[model samples]
Every structure is written in structure tokens, then in C-alpha cells.
Target: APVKSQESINQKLALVIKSGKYTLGYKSTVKSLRQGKSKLIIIAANTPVLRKSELEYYAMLSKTKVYYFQGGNNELGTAVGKLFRVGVVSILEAGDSDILTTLA
Candidate 1:
């Protein structure tokens, strides 16, 4: 069932993106999480962990998803720079529409 669709991903992303939280780069994600300033953290695939289990520890402690955004390095890079993004759970409002129609 391989079909052409940014549908699922795009839809999921739209829900979280609209929440008006923050998107931090790899380093900042960790830092922000530690500082308790960030509500959520969107880390890209290319992100490296200098400290072992930090993300896991903090994400659990912070109650954040620590999700991986898909699409590609391009999307990751863009998202880090606040340009745009993708295989990760997004930081969003509690009550929002996680639907397809609004994304486009």
C-alpha cells in the first residue's frame, strides 16, 4: 500500500505546529529541556547525542515526546532554523485538530 502522500505526516504536523510552542536545534533542545523552559523538543535524525541517555532521561522527566521528525535532512535542517519540518511528535496544544484538511 505504498502511495504518494504527504497526507498523514502533513496532517499530524499541522496539529502540533499551530500550538505556538518552540522548536530548538539539537543542542538547544537538550539545553532547553534541562532548563525547563521548553514545553517540547523536536529533534531531527541527524542529531547527535553527546551525552548518553540525556534525551531519554529528560524527555521522560520533562514529559516530552522527544520525537524524530521525518522527511529528510532538508526538513530537519529547515525546522531547526525555524524554516519548516517533518518523523517526530510535535509540541502542540492539548485540544487541537489532528486532521489532514487544515495542513494544506
Candidate 2:
């Protein structure tokens, strides 16, 4: 079910956070994607169209997978235990996280 995938995503996110192998923020994510340093790009559902398209475009060129977080920026921020809103995230390494399967 969709719930299973979503939960798996969150669990993997927790692992990424614990390992500190992720980048948080639109600018940083974009930079990482361009440099091919990010294995995955996760963007909030409410992200602006231009930026979302830009991220997807770059990810395509970099051959990196991109995911649209099913929630808005606020929810995304909460997922990462941050006080500020996060519209984008760049996963530099999977570490112990198994989110790649969910992304697929």
C-alpha cells in the first residue's frame, strides 16, 4: 500500500539524518545535483514550479533520482526535526538508509 511506502521513506529519512549524509535546502540541493554528489533529490510538494522543474531537469541530466515529498515544506521540516521549512533535500549518501527501493 501507499502507506507502507510512505512509512519506509520516513524511516530511511531518519537513517539519513542520523548518518548526516544529506543536504537540506534548495540551493545546496541544486549544487549537489549539479556536481553529481547527490544520489537522490527530495522536494516538498508545495515547492515553486520553476524550482521544481529545475531540480527535476538537473536530476535527469545527472542521472539522479528525484522524489516529490507528499507533504508541504512545513511537514518536510517536521520530518527532519527542523524548526524552519525545508523545500528541498539532497541525499549525498544512503549510508544505512534503504530509501532507494521506495524511491523506485
Judged by lDDT, which candidate is best? 2
Q: After superposition, how far is residue 39 of candidate 2 from its true place, in Å?
A: 1.4
Residue-by-residue lDDT tens digits, candidate 2, 1-104:
15446555666687767875787777778787888766778776477788788999888877778888747535567556566676477676777666655565
Per-residue lDDT for 1-104 in model 1, tens only? 01344444444455455554554444655665776544444444443554325665777777555544434454434322445343233343324553222332
TM-score of each: 0.49, 0.80
Candidate 2, pairs of clashing residues? none
Number of colliding residue pairs in model 2: 0
